[PDB]
Amino acid sequence: MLKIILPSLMLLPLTWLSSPKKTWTNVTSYSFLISLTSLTLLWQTDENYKNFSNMFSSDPLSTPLIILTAWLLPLMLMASQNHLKKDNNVLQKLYISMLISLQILLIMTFSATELIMFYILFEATLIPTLIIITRWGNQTERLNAGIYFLFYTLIGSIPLLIALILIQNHVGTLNLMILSFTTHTLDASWSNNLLWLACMMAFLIKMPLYGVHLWLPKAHVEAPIAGSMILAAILLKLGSYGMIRISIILDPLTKYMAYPFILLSLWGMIMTSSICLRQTDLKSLIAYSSVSHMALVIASIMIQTPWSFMGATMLMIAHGLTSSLLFCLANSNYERIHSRTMIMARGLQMVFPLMATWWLMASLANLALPPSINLMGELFITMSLFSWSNFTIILMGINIIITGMYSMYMIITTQRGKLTNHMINLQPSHTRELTLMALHMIPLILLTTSPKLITGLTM
Amino acid sequence: MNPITLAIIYFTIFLGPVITMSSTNLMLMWVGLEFSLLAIIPMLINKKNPRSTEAATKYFVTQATASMIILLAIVLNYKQLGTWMFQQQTNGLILNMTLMALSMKLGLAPFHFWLPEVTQGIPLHMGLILLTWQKIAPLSILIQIYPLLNSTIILMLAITSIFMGAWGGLNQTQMRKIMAYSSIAHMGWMLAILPYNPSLTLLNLMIYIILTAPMFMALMLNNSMTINSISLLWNKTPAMLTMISLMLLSLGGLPPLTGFLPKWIIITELMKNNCLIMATLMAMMALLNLFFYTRLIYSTSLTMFPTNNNSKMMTHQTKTKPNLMFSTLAIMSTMTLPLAPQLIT
Amino acid sequence: LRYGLLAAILGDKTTKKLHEYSRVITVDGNICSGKNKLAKEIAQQLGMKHYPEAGIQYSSTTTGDGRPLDIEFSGSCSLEKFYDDPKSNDGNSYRLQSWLYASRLLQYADALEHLLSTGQGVVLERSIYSDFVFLEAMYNQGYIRKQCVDHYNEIKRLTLPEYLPPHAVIYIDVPVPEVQSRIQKKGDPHEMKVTSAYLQDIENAYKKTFLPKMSEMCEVLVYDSWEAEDPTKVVEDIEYLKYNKGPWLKQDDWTFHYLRMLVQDKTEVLNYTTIPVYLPEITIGAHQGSRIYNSFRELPGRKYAPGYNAEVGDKWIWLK
Amino acid sequence: QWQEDPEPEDENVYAKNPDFHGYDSDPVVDVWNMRAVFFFGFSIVLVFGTTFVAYVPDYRMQEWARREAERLVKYREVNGLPIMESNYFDPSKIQLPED
């Protein structure tokens, strides 16, 4: 991993030692080249996972998440340029450094071999995330959004820290490979049931689980666009990735311990998807859509089947690209009229025909049109849950209906109908903006062509 | 003060703790604590206003009372065993009043009420001495008798200090009072681990000191006594915004900053001794500290509060501060977690 | 070696430098009373340093290259605007007065620093001790709010007691009907708009407050215009003053050391003029505040500390 | 009121530079930022990254496993052995509890 991490660290001096007129062109270009180098992790010609050293590894679960992380950094930079163009030069460089910091921290997080190392990097990400939300968010509610985000995470993370220390005191190590091979059955004591919850809650809050999700709609509505991109695409996946790594040592208590969280997720995914039908704020709508999708990820990880893990891995990647695309699409209208109210701008297909095409594909991805990886992940999750209990299809069926309703509702409301023609400041789409949309959507199509790369650990 | 007075008084402030740390005899340790009390009073009251007089008086009566209780324990032990050091055979009540009186000297809760008031009434550079240099002598005594101390009293003092340091700091708009509550919370962590691993007490003391010293220097740069005063930093000395933010997050124990290390290691050691419930309670309520530090970070570097017209005249003036000790401590208090194995053993 | 405790211990001491004319003298009076011509000649005849009256640009001219700055960098206040519309709802009247108090405070610290470090006396034209006569006149004419008065008295309470007052206060008494005639002959378009009621308030504040207050601790010398017109007569009165009252009598080497430590540190001098009291007249929002501050650091010689600005010819930066 | 700037006015980015690409107000900086994104993002990463992934051989030993399966199916059938047995481990290698 050092041949990926070291060049990423060199982006920081590159940012600060570049001329003001070359900073964006420089950092974006090398960020693309670093994404290219991360593809080396996909050269996997056997079934032994790559252990580069005692500290860094990569297997079929972390490899897609590392590459998606590397790809997001250039995309976030392009997304940020227009709304930062009034900041002075030092403030622009500070913002870029925050974005690089997350890229470095997240790549290290997904390749860490030891759980307290994962925990430290997992917690470190809050610092640049909070700074981005609160220093560059637009509204007065960005400060409250920062508090919710930081402290929903932290209250769950403290029990996680206790559990990790406890496991290490008992086993002698937090190395993941050794924990895997030497794992032994747990007794079903009250003490072990609290251990299960301490190991799971921080990851479940991060997903977020329905019930403790209020931080996420707040954080998205208030964050700048690059903050929304990283939060929806990668940061939520830390919880799902954490749950998959740590659940190997929690057997057999997950068989009964999972029931309340399957119930919250399967019912909760209907509550949050139905909220999207009556949401007046476009960013909030996309955010609630994420909570509904991540509810599926929670359910499939909880039932721990080969299909359920594979469907969760695909959905994690597919949602990452799709939701980041939707935030970028919404931000392009906001940068023109400076409102997130969905019903304000209307008939936009009349004036932005190619941007409306990007809107349609993002919406078709979101409602899981086959053969997209969006549908493939949701399909295999549905099959595994049906096996777990045939009555799950009732709640799946309701969510599928509602997801089509709000996905097409967003398109009809904003792109169709009569143009709101008092909006004479609807400047034509930027080349940068149209390029940004394509950089989301080409990988989604390419991954649909070769879905072996995101199947995860079980297939 | 003229130079002769400064030299004598500062020398006595330095001398007392050195006597306490080097003494075999418990009476000479008490003498060292006596030098500290006597020498620091004229510095506390140097500026001579009603608030500084109140602060010096409250400090004197608390410290002198605690000193008498410590002396009682020393004398009772001399009566019991004919020696001038505490032993394994020292009566447990004698050791419990030593712990009580030293914790009152340190300002641990529930003997804490004086400390936020005295810190508020004195100059910032004296608050710095009060919360750093003056902790060393009473802690040094405790570390010597760590196998003799009662774990029950310690943990109750420790959890109480963390709880009241947290809730105490939540209501403050005065910087000197926020630092005092930050002191009490960190002393709660130092004390909790003392009977188990006194080396980790010293690790926490060192990291607390190198966090607190540059935080006081940052307040001293413009004499920022309140949240609203420190919120003008963006206009007066914006270059400090990065390091104040990281020092505040380090004081709150957020990873990957150096201040995460003391909380992390103490939890590890407490749970090696099955002190799981206290460690959980301690770590959970320490998050409340991060809340009021974050609110402080919100008003300094992450938003820009309204400024005033006279501040433009300040921008015309050159400053000669901070000294380069600020940068050294600021960097080592925030960016040294990668060197954690070299700090614990 | 910058002045400090070490330099003080190594001989650098104020009382060795004080001589007969190591005095602080201020010249007061109404507008157009002849203070400047008198202050210049008192200083010249006594071998003292003349400080022209601190104006809006005083800080601008004693820092940087000494050239005046754009007004948004210099208090964003206008004397001409004050006379055109003393009741403007943009807060110009009190913003001006607050800025002028702080500029006077800076000058008083600069003059005291000069006297304490050299032993040469200084001659001032009004001072922080007499700045309030203008504030009272504004308030009595309804030009500023009462809250502006309370704000001003708080800043004065926090700053003025730290300093030593002048040795001698010289007052020129010109009646208001004569002051008005001199302003009209002076020929300034905006100053000609000053009401006589405003000038009377200044005189009332001077004669009921400032002079009785100053006589408790300073030598006070009052002159009419005809006496002041011959500055050699005023000097002769100064040469034979006794200076047997006030705080300067109980100063010693170490009280002078600590006053010198205050007055060489200008941000310490100006500290309490910037307390966060959110009077609208003198409160700047962050958008304006940060735009102004960013532009100031783009002026020549202002991006870095003095001696580190390569674009104004500073050299050896890599070894400084 | 306090002293605060008025809100800035809406600006049309294309009014001064009708060839604006979205990257910078300076036209030359703008076009080169556009070219770098298109060259490194699309010409390099998306084309060569796609090519490199396409030619990763035997990804996760899927080609070897089918090749190995055919070898075993062939072997297990000529010799009359079962294609796949219920017991992964030979029972002779296992010692069950007496009870």
Partner: peptide, 19 residues
């Protein structure tokens, strides 16, 4: 619209003796 920054009413909630 411009980024919101604290106004007088926001800053005055820290001007009290306590929070």
């Amino acid at each position: 619209a411009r980024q919101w920054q604290p106004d007088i009413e926001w800053a005055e909630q820290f001007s009290g003796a306590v929070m």
